[PDB]
Amino acid sequence: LYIQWL
């Protein structure tokens, strides 16, 4: 799992 929030 990759959670990437910008």
Side-chain angles (χ1 to χ4, degrees):
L1 174 57
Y2 193 1
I3 300 174
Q4 179 188 47
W5 295 347
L6 286 81

